[PDB]
From Swiss-Prot, chain A:
InterPro entries per record: Class_I_gatase-like, GATASE, GMP_synth_C, GMP_synth_GATase, GMP_synthase, GMPS_ATP_PPase_dom, Rossmann-like_a/b/a_fold
GO CC annotations, alphabetized: cytosol
Function: Catalyzes the synthesis of GMP from XMP.
Domain GMPS ATP-PPase, residue spans: 187-358
UniProt binding sites for ATP: S214, G215, G216, V217, D218, S219, S220
SUBUNIT field: Homodimer.
Alphabetical list of NCBIfam families matching this protein: guaA_Cterm (TIGR00884), guaA_Nterm (TIGR00888), PRK00074.1 (NF000848)
Active site feature: C78 (nucleophile), H161, E163
Protein name listed in UniProt: GMP synthase [glutamine-hydrolyzing]
Amino acid sequence: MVLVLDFGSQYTRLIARRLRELRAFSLILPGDAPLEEVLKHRPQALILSGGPRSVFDPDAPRPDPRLFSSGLPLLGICYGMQLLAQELGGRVERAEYGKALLTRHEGPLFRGLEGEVQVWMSHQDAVTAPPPGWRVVAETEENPVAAIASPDGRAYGVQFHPEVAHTPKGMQILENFLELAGVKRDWTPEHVLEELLREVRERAGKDRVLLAVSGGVDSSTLALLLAKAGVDHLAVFVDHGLLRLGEREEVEGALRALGVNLLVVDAKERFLKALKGVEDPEEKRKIIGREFVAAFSQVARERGPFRFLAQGTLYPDVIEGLPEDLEFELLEPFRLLFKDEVRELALLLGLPDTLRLRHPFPGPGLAVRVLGEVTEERLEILRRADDIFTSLLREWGLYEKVAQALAVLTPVGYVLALRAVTTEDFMTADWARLPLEFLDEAARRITRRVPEIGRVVYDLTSKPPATIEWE
Amino acid sequence: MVLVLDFGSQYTRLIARRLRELRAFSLILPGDAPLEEVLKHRPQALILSGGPRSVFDPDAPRPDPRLFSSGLPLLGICYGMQLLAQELGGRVERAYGKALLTRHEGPLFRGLEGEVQVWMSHQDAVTAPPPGWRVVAETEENPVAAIASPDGRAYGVQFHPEVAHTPKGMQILENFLELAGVKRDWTPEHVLEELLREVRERAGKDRVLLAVSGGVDSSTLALLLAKAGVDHLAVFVDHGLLRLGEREEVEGALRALGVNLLVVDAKERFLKALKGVEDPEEKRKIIGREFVAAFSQVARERGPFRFLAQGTLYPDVIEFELLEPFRLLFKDEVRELALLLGLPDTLRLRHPFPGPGLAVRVLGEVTEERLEILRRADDIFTSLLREWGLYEKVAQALAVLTPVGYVLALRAVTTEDFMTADWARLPLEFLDEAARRITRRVPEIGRVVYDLTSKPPATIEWE
């Protein structure tokens, strides 16, 4: 249990993610969390995140004064490091990041790092004087105080972000700190699984659990958890006719093979009819959502009763409407986990890599990948182009080397846009720098095998400022 | 001068260009032209082009039988080498693709030493050369890759030296010209002198009318006329569908160089005329009608004019009396005459731009707002290409505006055969810079894409 004190950094969640990837359960709390509330979880260590505001800004979150006095090991990152200096007798003086090389990095905190240590430095403000007794353990060419450490090696501050990719050796730094903090590592995959099975069993007991399955690894792993736990359940797969080619069969075949009670609902006509004449994306998503709860509710009524409704709510969600007649008790086993941790559970639960390592697919499926009204003919064309794109990516082994890959159909008689992105911070996304020979092969095969498509293009837009999906 | 006998090959025009690139003038005549029409051109050599038919097909183009005895040095390519073999005692049987010549000898392969990749024709094959002829070239699969007559004046090759896929093809054709003693009569200073002389004697003191579009061809036609001292009226019709700053740059340059220029402000006409039309076909038709209406209006209003000068080019060949001094030239040769006529590189090395202008680069109806958005994006794309030295490295670069709120498609192509076009393999870092620069300076554009479609199966322009 490591508490990440959130002082506003866009990377606060990422820090919480690195601690999980380092087998330390982590929880996030507001920076100005009262000492009692932060102590109630009995945390082994505290990590003070960076923040967009200055240590002088009146509207800047301050921790609980008594915080720095808990023998509790501490790691202040940027803003966090500054609060350390300021509230312990050091000197801080006067918002953007930038790459820099540490010209010096000594002590246990940098134990193991050799060669060049590039770090993602924060440039708002600076510690010019470490707290009395503390030592400067790192610096860059421009900043003589890049990192500080108390004489007993319990508290450390760094002027850079070891949690971001721009600090390639950051994970080693974070490791050193956990050891130095005496943080026990009780967040391993087998432990989580055993723990989750236990909880699902006690919670649901002899009662029945209802849940929606979309084919995504999250809901698929949730179904496998319930089935493995031996809890009575019904997994419902709503086939809105907006899926990729062969997806329904693939998902139903595998989940049944692994023993989940599955019900596939054919609602293709329902959704298509409901989408007729609709071009507005937000409208499409509202209608799709509406039609889904309606078909799902019908299942819940005919196959009821159901005491629990299980959902794949993840930790990022926690950090962030069924009909009247239906009333369930929420069962969210993954609410404290990150997706990759769920993907690991899937491996432990036996999900074949075919369904375990696929890219995310939106609830509205292909309806938001057709620019303009969704018709069956358009979906038919798009599905074939998409299927060809996906397949070529796999053949070259590029499918697993991008975070997302999709095709968008624009009526004009059709232009198809290939869209692939990669990501290093799980917030931004760059258009994928794919081999041009691959893009050429994709375009030729598509226009050749799908005569309706007369032109293929590749999206060169990143996130920001655009979205991954086109609508 | 070197004559090219056309037996139907899609590369015939290409054979003609290559010869020009070897500073030898060349003309194309039907492969069946009589030996009389062939000789009136006083050819120093002859090249028999390939063809899509077999020398056995009953409808296969046949040359004048007297040709093979005319004494003219000749080079038969593919189907042409077949004719040669057949019509002289050789044997041909019913048998493209990259291939390596495992053997080559003689003057036709001088300097070719090493690997020689050729673009083979596999329609038929010469199994036995004419009596007394030598087999000077071979491929691992074709024992008869090329043949040479005893007097060393005739040759046949089973591959296409005129296409890039035959890297050392130009050297082969060069060797042929050297063998045949062809004189290098195709230099721009000579051509220009000839053209000035010709236009001056045709125009006399009559008035010559001609439309200038900003394109190097029409700009060079204007400079030729001005340099010849001909009485002319160059009409620049500003239809408001041009690139940013074009009219100002074109008129300032042409007038500074001597041209008698008349710029016409017909922006409203075209814009108005284009209201609500999305059909690409209608757009082109409408714009074409509007241009004629504006040009004719100026014609009736001045002069009068006896001659109408047009920049018709050789590939085009392949109330007024027309005057097309460039009908035997290729675009590049005109860009060269422009050099000789003092046209500054700024207006001499630009990519082609269509008559319909930016109208065909907007997927939908042309409105001034869309024109202003596209115009700015295009300008940015263009400048970035110039800044990075990539502009002259593509055959065409354009941007297409698509309403979605607009998605902009960047489109660039390269070409090796002046018939096919590949989407340009530009550096991805450059594409990223163009995409970021465009979305940042042109807020209305929320997304930038790159066209990955070659020709075939698609066109260079989107509509």
